[PDB]
Design a protein around this nucleic acid. Structure first.
Lengths: 63, 57
DNA sequence: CCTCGTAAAACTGTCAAC
DNA sequence: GTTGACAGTTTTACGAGG
């Protein structure tokens, strides 16, 4: 596998900005994000997949 | 302390690549060679360096 | 393309030993 | 005042299976 790459804070800032609007991305916004961030459409599909994973385990809650 | 020559090398690398201070796996082989430090040690150095030197910039 | 489990590169909190 | 190290955690990245 080709080594993972941490995203810039500028990039991350963008995603969360849109993720806060809705947690699943549309095809048009996926394109604008991809242009904005310099990231592949795939990379952001997966980022959102992984982002929801994180939110689902902030259901914690009984702590 | 690490040997001072091992530090200088990695720091010179670090500053050369400030905007993306993440060596490739191959680059880590090389820095560990030139320094005589182990690959873990090089990795820990850049981990500690990124939060101790880069982020303030 | 989703949720899922998994890996593994990089980060966090921490501290004795400088 | 820093620094090397590491257990514990978070972050990219994939395939399985649907």
């Amino acid at each position: 596998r080709k080594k993972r790459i941490p995203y810039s804070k500028g990039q991350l800032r963008e995603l969360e900005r849109e993720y806060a609007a809705n947690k699943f991305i549309t095809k048009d916004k996926r394109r604008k994000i991809s242009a904005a961030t310099s990231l592949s459409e795939r990379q952001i599909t997966i980022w959102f997949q992984n982002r929801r994973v994180k939110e689902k385990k902030v259901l914690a809650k009984v702590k | 302390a690490f040997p001072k020559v091992a530090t200088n090398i990695m720091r010179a690398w670090l500053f050369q690549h400030l905007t993306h201070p993440y060596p490739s796996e191959e680059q880590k082989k090389q820095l560990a060679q030139d320094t005589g430090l182990t690959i873990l040690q090089v990795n820990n150095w850049f981990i500690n360096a990124r939060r101790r030197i880069v982020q303030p910039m």
